[PDB]
Amino acid sequence: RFLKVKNWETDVVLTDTLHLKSTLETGCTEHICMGSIMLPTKDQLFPLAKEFLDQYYSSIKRFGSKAHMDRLEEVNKEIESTSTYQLKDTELIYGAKHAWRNASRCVGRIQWSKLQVFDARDCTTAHGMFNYICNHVKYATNKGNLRSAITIFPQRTDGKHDFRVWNSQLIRYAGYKQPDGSTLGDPANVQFTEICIQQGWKAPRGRFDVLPLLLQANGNDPELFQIPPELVLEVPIRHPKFDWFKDLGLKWYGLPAVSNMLLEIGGLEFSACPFSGWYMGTEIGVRDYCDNSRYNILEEVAKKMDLDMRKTSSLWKDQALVEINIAVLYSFQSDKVTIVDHHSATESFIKHMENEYRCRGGCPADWVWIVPPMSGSITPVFHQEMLNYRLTPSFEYQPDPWNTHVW
Amino acid sequence: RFLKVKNWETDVVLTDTLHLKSTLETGCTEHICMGSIMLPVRTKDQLFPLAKEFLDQYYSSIKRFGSKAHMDRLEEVNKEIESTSTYQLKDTELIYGAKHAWRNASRCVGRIQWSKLQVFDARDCTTAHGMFNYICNHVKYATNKGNLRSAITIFPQRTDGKHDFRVWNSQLIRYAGYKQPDGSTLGDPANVQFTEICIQQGWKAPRGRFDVLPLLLQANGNDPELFQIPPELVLEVPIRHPKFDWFKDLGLKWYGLPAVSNMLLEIGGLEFSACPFSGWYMGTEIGVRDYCDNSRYNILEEVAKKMDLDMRKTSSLWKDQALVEINIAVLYSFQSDKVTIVDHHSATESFIKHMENEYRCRGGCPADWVWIVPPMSGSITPVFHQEMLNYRLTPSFEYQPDPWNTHVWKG
Ligand code: HEM
Ligand code: HEM
Ligand SMILES: Cc1cc(N)nc(CCc2cc(F)cc(CC[C@@H]3C[C@H](F)CN3C)c2)c1
Ligand SMILES: Cc1cc(N)nc(CCc2cc(F)cc(CC[C@@H]3C[C@H](F)CN3C)c2)c1
Ligand SMILES: C[C@H](O)[C@H](O)[C@H]1CNc2nc(N)[nH]c(=O)c2N1
Ligand SMILES: C[C@H](O)[C@H](O)[C@H]1CNc2nc(N)[nH]c(=O)c2N1
Ligand SMILES: [Zn+2]
């Protein structure tokens, strides 16, 4: 019950005890493992707050102090009267850093403690949300020297006054279904690109059209805002060996900024909490460009390479996939925009695991998501056993707003 | 209670009811998932329910559930257990059980072929020489001059655990590995410990980089004995590359027949501790793992050197570049010598068809995503985007401890 994880490339064995702190459920049972499934009142609130505050005052080596019990009583009092409570700034920063730290699917967690936390709990309107988000984008982009950041909008009250960012990421390319057949732009964003136009957006109907922001303050109807183009750093995609690569007309944005998740701290639900870091190269080159349900450019790259596309066993998809991902890294590095290759990021994560087992006793990790989508077994995480369990504070998925919002 | 899995590339959703017939445990709990963990003595008490459960399955599949043949076989198995503490499978039951052990192997991407297994009954075998003969015949049959055929050979079942039949090799055909005094390894680093046992048991090692290991065979619980597989039975493919003429000068070769020999087959509560089985290779087993794992032949360096890649920073993806060429070479060499092989795109697409068929005619298909997804180019194969439910059905193939750790030595 004090479990161990073996690395099969190095025979290193770590002993996990943090998992016994786990609270939420995995979706698995003793009879079935769901490890590859994408998505599985006053009374409940105070224990949630007590648990959070308890781990908070332990982190500052003040467990069982006057300040501890005072804050416990203080929050206890506020919950009994107000039926919720407000986090101290110090608790808010800690809660957010640990939500990232606890994100078992995230390979970039070695950087968890350097997060820049922007308190936007004083926000009241979508224009205000826009302003906070513009400031976030500029701070995080930092002229290509990217910096991690989260901006936290007011917490849920009764579920009728929810703050929500309707975009899945702050920066995303539009996608338009075609009269003849398939999709122009990004197919993953077709419904959202629809709802923007269907809410008022004027689409330039290109391939790499930056979507507008669709912001919902206090449960009101959402509003469209265009992010100033000078704040959207983009990288033209070229190849260091293939001069015809520019001709493909590819580019990507520099800032990955997830905006549709829910941040849970001490029982409190922050439904609008956009956070950003920097890209791992394969997120763009393997998934964004080469997924069949996305930009799906493999055929054309292989064609331009004059590879034998007659049989799958010539490995022409594999050959193109590598070249595409070399170009993405070359392009970002050339333009001095932060990016990490999957070899560096997974090595970093092994070192982060070793740190967490050492200074914390564990590290929840989701192998299905930590292993990169290309060249999996030549990366050290492939041979690393990992235990997956849910700690809190946490980032959680939430329903898409348009399915919910009393419009 | 029904369960759904979604393919996120195609939005195809499937409904699993077969997980209801799940008996064994996964290792997971509601509070921890052990999905990435590699590998996480039976009395008459619990044996008849395990037999009854198996025989119910067997007669259901031949559409004879509740027949007189079914009830008489239950009763005959009953008395045989209480009188002898074990029981013997009929030939039909052995074939059914072993095919279904393969069918239930949740980590096996090649299961579309499960119904075509050739089953060799070796339950009359009694000595290590008899085992060697059966194994030679298996290799000849399965190799079929390069037109590989799946097969399994089944030696006598466990009795009191003190008389096990075991094949001490992890695979019937494997290359030796030799630890040098300077710290380096010659041959296959994965086989250094087994190679040392063989040398201790009297094997004269040629000490090359591709020495076929001898068979080390244990019958009825006696000390194991050494036999050399006749070289003309061991089909090997020199590896060359279709564009790189220098690739042949690396001196690489691999054997054609993948044949796992250290697993336990469980049917109706009976334990078959020696059940070597064989199929054909997916190219990545050789080109990604066998050659490019840091803990195997690890040729990425020299291939990248001969390709004159930018090897300084990892962000040039020279490692990913060399891996693809090596895997082109393995596929080209096998197809050119007409030795059966399947690429990882074909195999995973076939498996998706298999799985959808299993959901439709069987109510599910237990699948271990961590093992099904190929070790290169994961997300450009259809299994990456496929949700999968993992659970344990019997008959099954199980891991067992290495025999040199448990065996009581006669001398
Ligand atoms: C700074 C560099 C970062 C890198 C390289 C990185 C990388 C990744 C990758 C590759 C994934 C896999 C998901 C996918 O493939 O779409 C992921 C998931 C995730 N990341 Fe990180 N990330 C970074 C920063 C952050 C930050 C700053 C946060 C939060 C403050 C965060 C939170 C998460 C969460 C919650 C998930 C899981 C989503 C889920 O459960 O499905 N990441 N990350
Ligand atoms: C016919 C072509 C076959 C192919 C291409 C194939 C391929 C594979 C692959 C790639 C794996 C993953 C394990 C690894 O990478 O080391 C695997 C596992 C497995 N295969 Fe298949 N296989 C084939 C035939 C068979 C046969 C004939 C059997 C048994 C009769 C079998 C039983 C298994 C089992 C039990 C596992 C699970 C290993 C474990 O639990 O660790 N396979 N196979
Ligand atoms: C901050 C950051 C840094 C970085 N390097 N990368 C990212 C993007 C990774 C990601 C994180 C997340 F918290 C949720 C999603 C949504 C995943 C989507 C949603 C759907 F369910 C299937 N996935 C395609 C994606 C973010
Ligand atoms: C029949 C067949 C066809 C095919 N195409 N391939 C294989 C080999 C794959 C494999 C299958 C198996 F049933 C057990 C193992 C044992 C796993 C060992 C242990 C360690 F993890 C490294 N593996 C080599 C490996 C077999
Ligand atoms: C830690 C991890 O479970 C281990 O490295 C597994 C992962 N998936 C695998 N998948 C296959 N096909 N073969 C393997 O050896 C492994 N190794
Ligand atoms: C079905 C499967 O769970 C799904 O395709 C997952 C697999 N692993 C993943 N891993 C990462 N990093 N990102 C993903 O979107 C997915 N998708
Ligand atoms: Zn699980």
Nearest to B252 by CA among B334, B351, B358: B334
| Amino acid identity, position B157 | Q
| Amino acid identity, position B166 | R
Residue A10: CA atoms inside 13 Å, Cβ hemisphere, count? Answer: 13
Return the ∠ at Cα B85 (arms to B102 and B166), rounded to 5°: 45
Q: Which residue of A has its CA nearest to B321?
A: A322
Is the separation of the CB atoms in A184 and A176 below 8 Å?
Answer: yes
- Where is chain A discontinuous (C–N over 2.5 Å), named by the preceding residue? 40
Give φ, ψ of B109 to 5 degrees: -75, -20
- Ligand 6: does its nearest atom lie under 6 Å from the Cβ of A378? no
Calpha distance A128→A124 (Å, rounded): 7
Is the separation of the CB atoms in A259 and A152 below 8 Å?
Answer: no
Contacts 24+ apart (CB under 8 A), A306-313: A312/B343, A312/B345, A312/B346, A313/B283, A313/B331, A313/B335, A313/B343, A313/B345, A313/B346
Question: For chain A, how big is the Rg over CA atoms in Å?
Answer: 23
Calpha distance A295→A297 (Å, rounded): 6
DSSP letters along A168-223, please?
A: SBSS-B-EEE-SSSSEEE-GGGHHHHHHHHTTT------SS-BPPEEEESTTPPPE
CA separation (Å) from B176 to A255, B89, B139? Answer: 50, 37, 19
DSSP state of B6: E
State the angle between helix axes of A42-59 and A66-82 in degrees (0 to 180), rounded to the nearest 10: 160
Residues in a beta bridge with A177: A183
- Given the structure tokens 């449960």, which residue do they identify? A219
Question: For chain B, how big is the Rg over CA atoms in Å?
Answer: 23
Q: Looking at A241-323, which runs of residues are DSSP E strands?
A: 251-253, 257-258, 262-265, 268-270, 275-276, 279-280
Calpha distance B180→B196 (Å, rounded): 12
Calpha distance A213→A136 (Å, rounded): 13
Length of chain B: 411
- Given the structure tokens 């099904």, which residue do they identify? B372
Is the separation of the CB atoms in A258 and A275 below 8 Å?
Answer: yes
In sequence order, the 6+-apart residues with CB closer than 8 A to the CB of A74 are none
Calpha distance B305→A303 (Å, rounded): 27
B297 touching A, CB under 8 A?
A: no
In sequence order, the 6+-apart residues with CB closer than 8 A to the CB of B255 are B173, B174, B175, B212, B234, B235, B236, B237
Element (H, E) at A139: helix A126-141
Q: How many of the other CB atoms lie within 10 Å of CB of A179? A: 5
Question: Which residue among B370, B376, B383 is best mutated to probe the pocket of ligand 5, counting the most ligand atoms within 8 A of its Cβ?
Answer: B370
Q: Going by CA atoms, what residue is nearest to atom 9 of ligand 1?
A: A106
In sequence order, the 6+-apart residues with CB closer than 8 A to the CB of A79 are A42, A45, A46, A49, A85
Calpha distance B105→B24 (Å, rounded): 13
Query: Strand pairing of B341-342 and B118-121?
Result: unpaired
Nearest to B140 by CA among B288, B278, B289: B278
Residue B140: CA atoms inside 13 Å, Cβ hemisphere, count? Answer: 10
| Two tokens, residue B54 | 């198996």
Is the separation of the CB atoms in A144 and A233 below 8 Å?
Answer: yes
First to last CA, chain A: 49
- Ligand 2: does its nearest atom lie under 6 Å from the Cβ of B117? yes
- Where is chain B discontinuous (C–N over 2.5 Å), named by the preceding residue? 40
Q: Going by CA atoms, what residue is nearest to atom 31 of ligand 2?
A: B102
Calpha distance B404→B390 (Å, rounded): 31
Q: How many of the other CB atoms lie within 10 Å of CB of A285? A: 29
User: ω into residue A372 within 30 of 0, thus cis?
Assistant: no
Question: Which residue among B99, B102, B108, B383 is best mutated to probe the pocket of ligand 2, counting the most ligand atoms within 8 A of its Cβ?
Answer: B108
Under 8 Å CB pairs connecting chains A and B tally to 208
Return the ∠ at Cα A10 (arms to A7 and A15), rounded to 5°: 45
Q: Going by CA atoms, what residue is nearest to atom 37 of ligand 1?
A: A105
Calpha distance A73→A49 (Å, rounded): 11
| Amino acid identity, position B27 | G
Counting Cβ atoms within 10 Å, is residue B164 exposed (0-12), middle (13-18) or buried (19+)? buried
Alpha helices in B62-151 (DSSP H): 68-84, 91-103, 128-143
CA separation (Å) from A281 to A23, A58, A143, A333? Answer: 34, 37, 19, 11
In sequence order, the 6+-apart residues with CB closer than 8 A to the CB of B150 are B113, B116, B117, B118, B142, B277, B278, B279, B280
Yes or no, beta carbons of B293 and A22 under 8 Å apart: no
Give which of B11, B20, B30, B36 to mutate to test A binding, by max A Cβ within 10 Å.
Answer: B36
In sequence order, the 6+-apart residues with CB closer than 8 A to the CB of A160 are A219, A406
First to last CA, chain B: 56
Calpha distance B220→A355 (Å, rounded): 49
Catalytic residues of A: 106, 109, 278, 283
Calpha distance B181→B194 (Å, rounded): 18
CA B276 to chain centre: 9
DSSP letters along B15-50, please?
A: EE-GGGG--S--S-BTTBB-TT-S-----HHHHHHH
B47: left (phi over 0), alpha (psi -120 to 50) or beta: alpha
Calpha distance A10→A16 (Å, rounded): 18
Query: Strand pairing of B118-121 and B151-154?
Result: parallel
Question: Which residue among B153, B260, B330 is best mutated to probe the pocket of ligand 4, counting the most ligand atoms within 8 A of its Cβ?
Answer: B260
**Mapping DSSP to helix (H, G, I), strand (E, B) and coil, where does residue B108 land?**
coil
Q: How many of the other CB atoms lie within 10 Å of CB of A308? A: 12
CA of B49 to the centre of ligand 2 (A): 29
In sequence order, the 6+-apart residues with CB closer than 8 A to the CB of A364 are A18, A19, A22, A102, A104, A387, A388, A389, A390, A391
Is the separation of the CB atoms in A165 and A154 below 8 Å?
Answer: no
By Cβ distance, the residue of B324, B328, B379 closest to A287 is B379
What sign for the dihedral angle of Cα A382, A387, A388, A393? negative
User: ω into residue A222 within 30 of 0, thus cis?
Assistant: no
Is the separation of the CB atoms in B151 and B342 below 8 Å?
Answer: no
Calpha distance A230→A213 (Å, rounded): 15
In sequence order, the 6+-apart residues with CB closer than 8 A to the CB of A77 are none
By Cβ distance, the residue of B27, B28, B376 closest to A376 is B376
Yes or no, beta carbons of A374 and B335 under 8 Å apart: no
Counting Cβ atoms within 10 Å, is residue A245 exposed (0-12), middle (13-18) or buried (19+)? buried
DSSP letters along A348-375, please?
A: HHHHHHHHHHHHTS-----HHHHS-SSS
| Two tokens, residue B59 | 């007669």
| Two tokens, residue B196 | 């040392």
Q: Looking at B289-399, which runs of residues are DSSP E strands?
A: 341-342, 396-398
| Residue B409 a catalytic site member | no
Calpha distance A16→B82 (Å, rounded): 45
In sequence order, the 6+-apart residues with CB closer than 8 A to the CB of B318 are B304, B307, B309, B310, B311
Nearest to B170 by CA among B234, B255, B263, B262: B262
- Given the structure tokens 């399947």, which residue do they identify? B342
Element (H, E) at A84: none
Residues 149-178 of B with CB under 8 A from A: none
CA separation (Å) from B42 to A33, B46, B50, B160? Answer: 27, 8, 11, 8
CA separation (Å) from B43 to A371, B47, B86, B103, B273? Answer: 43, 7, 8, 27, 16
| Residue B108 a catalytic site member | yes
Query: Strand pairing of B253-255 and B236-238?
Result: antiparallel
- Given the structure tokens 């190799």, which residue do they identify? B143
Burial readout A60-83 (b: 16 or more C-beta within 10 A, e: otherwise): eeeeeeeebeebbeebbeebeeee
Is the separation of the CB atoms in A198 and A183 below 8 Å?
Answer: no
Residue B51: CA atoms inside 13 Å, Cβ hemisphere, count? Answer: 26
In sequence order, the 6+-apart residues with CB closer than 8 A to the CB of A254 are A141, A144, A146, A233, A234, A235, A278, A279, A332, A337, A338
Structure-determination technique: X-ray
Domains of chain A: 16-121+148-158+262-276+346-370 (3.90.340.10), 122-147+162-233+397-401 (3.90.440.10), 234-256+279-344 (3.90.1230.10)
**Catalytic entry in B80, B196, B285, B398:** B285
Is the separation of the CB atoms in A346 and A370 below 8 Å?
Answer: yes
Is the separation of the CB atoms in B219 and B163 below 8 Å?
Answer: no
Q: Which residue of B has its CA nearest to A374?
A: B377
Is the separation of the CB atoms in B397 and B105 below 8 Å?
Answer: yes
| Two tokens, residue A359 | 């200074």
- Given the structure tokens 């709802």, which residue do they identify? A195
Ligand nearest to the CA of B262: 4
Calpha distance A376→B175 (Å, rounded): 25
Q: Going by CA atoms, what residue is nearest to atom 36 of ligand 2?
A: B108
DSSP state of A292: T
DSSP letters along B249-309, please?
A: GG--EEES--EE-S-EEEETTEEES---EE--EEHHIIIIIIHHSTTTT--HHHHHHHHT-
CA separation (Å) from B244 to A367, B241, B248? Answer: 36, 5, 8
Q: Which residue of A has its CA nearest to B293?
A: A378
Residue A132: CA atoms inside 13 Å, Cβ hemisphere, count? Answer: 28
CA B123 to chain centre: 21
Query: Strand pairing of B166-167 and B151-154?
Result: unpaired
| Two tokens, residue A150 | 């989260």
